[PDB]
Amino acid sequence: MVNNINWVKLPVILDRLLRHPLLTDLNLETAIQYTLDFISAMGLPNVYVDKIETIDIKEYRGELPCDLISINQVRLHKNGIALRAMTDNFNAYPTHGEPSFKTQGRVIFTSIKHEKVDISYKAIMLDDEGLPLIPDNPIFLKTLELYIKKEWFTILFDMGKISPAVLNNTQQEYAFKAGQCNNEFVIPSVSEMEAITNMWNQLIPRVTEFRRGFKNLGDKEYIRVH
Amino acid sequence: FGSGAIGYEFDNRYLNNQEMSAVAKQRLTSLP
Numbered sequence: 402m403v404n405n406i407n408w409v410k411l412p413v414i415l416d417r418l419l420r421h422p423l424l425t426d427l428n429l430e431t432a433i434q435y436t437l438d439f440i441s442a443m444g445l446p447n448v449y450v451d452k453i454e455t456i457d458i459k460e461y462r463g464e465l466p467c468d469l470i471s472i473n474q475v476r477l478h479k480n481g482i483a484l485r486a487m488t489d490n491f492n493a494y495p496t497h498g499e500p501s502f503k504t505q506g507r508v509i510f511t512s513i514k515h516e517k518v519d520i521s522y523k524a525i526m527l528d529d530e531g532l533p534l535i536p537d538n539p540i541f542l543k544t545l546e547l548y549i550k551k552e553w554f555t556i557l558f559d560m561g562k563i564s565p566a567v568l569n570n571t572q573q574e575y576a577f578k579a580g581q582c583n584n585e586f587v588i589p590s591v592s593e594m595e596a597i598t599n600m601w602n603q604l605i606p607r608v609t610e611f612r613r614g615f616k617n618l619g620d621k622e623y624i625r626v627h
Numbered sequence: 628f629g630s631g632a633i634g635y636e637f638d639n640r641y642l643n644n645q646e647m648s649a650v651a652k653q654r655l656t657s658l659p
Contacts, residue, residue: 561650565653565654565655568655569655569656572655
């Protein structure tokens with residue numbers, strides 16, 4: 402992402418929607434739900450807050466933080482060696498290796514019995530209220546506004562209170578801005594294309610960046626003169 | 628004289644069939 406994510410409260414999206422006199426029955430409560438549907442459906446990893454927590458595994462199980470949304474990596478605390486993924490069907494089960502993890506709910510399922518693990522994860526940024534906080538990006542803000550205008554107009558079109566030409570314009574305009582908003586958040590900055598440059602140009606290919614926290618991923622590869 | 632429970636339901640049904648024709652011309656078009 403080229404621009405920085407400056408945070409603003411959710412009611413800044415309601416100044417923009419209630420400029421439209423057909424969207425004047427909108428609420429904070431409706432703006433809360435349609436934001437989280439929009440934040441999810443875009444899947445932009447720049448909208449989330451990166452956190453790291455150390456949890457302790459009791460017997461192939463550990464309790465996961467409350468704010469966790471997606472795990473970046475799980476690693477061991479004493480080694481720093483990262484855990485990949487549990488493909489075993491019979492993991493902590495005895496009959497009569499490379500460590501792994503698996504997460505379903507608020508429980509993580511590891512391959513190690515009694516160990517502390519660091520979990521680097523993503524959460525949602527909150528307010529003084531326990532409410533979501535959105536980027537002030539006028540591309541993000543415009544297409545979140547067009548998201549809610551397209552969900553409200555879809556209800557109104559089912560009711561028969563909106564022209565099919567009106568909904569077709571809103572469905573088209575949200576469809577353009579959703580790609581512009583995707584490209585706004587995905588396309589790297591100059592400082593991220595340098596780390597992409599160093600990963601791409603490697604005379605001796607570095608193929609074990611998952612073992613670290615992808616720390617040396619964008620590091621530059623140097624060759625001695627001889 | 629007067630009684631309008633069959634004049635009403637026939638007029639209400641004619642406006643229904645006229646409304647039904649109007650919603651059958653609605654198209655959400657699918658070119659760019």
